[PDB]
């Protein structure tokens with residue numbers, strides 16, 4: 275429980291982060307050409323929010339996996355110096371930092 279309440283703390287802080295705008299909603303393949311083909315397991319903050327609310331996270335490491343999946347998909351699809359890419363690095367570094375503020 276104390277495990278998964280810090281996940282809420284992290285997810286809340288990630289949802290309201292300045293650089294969270296690319297990862298708030300699922301990627302729209304109708305708008306992002308090639309995303310369907312390149313990324314096989316899309317993930318975003320709202321999907322993590324849906325699952326966490328509904329309790330679908332057995333442990334905190336299942337929560338961290340979905341978080342790292344957001345940024346792996348980001349680095350896979352976006353160049354590091356792209357706008358989404360630059361935001362993904364800010365978000366990936368923020369997550370890992372806050373995550374070790376706990377573990």
Ligand SMILES: Cc1ncccc1N[C@H]1CCCS(=O)(=O)C1
Nearest residue numbers: 296297300301302305306351358
């Ligand atoms: C997270 C991400 N990964 C790859 C490409 C783009 C994005 N950003 C989103 C910006 C809002 C709408 S969107 O659906 O175009 C996609």
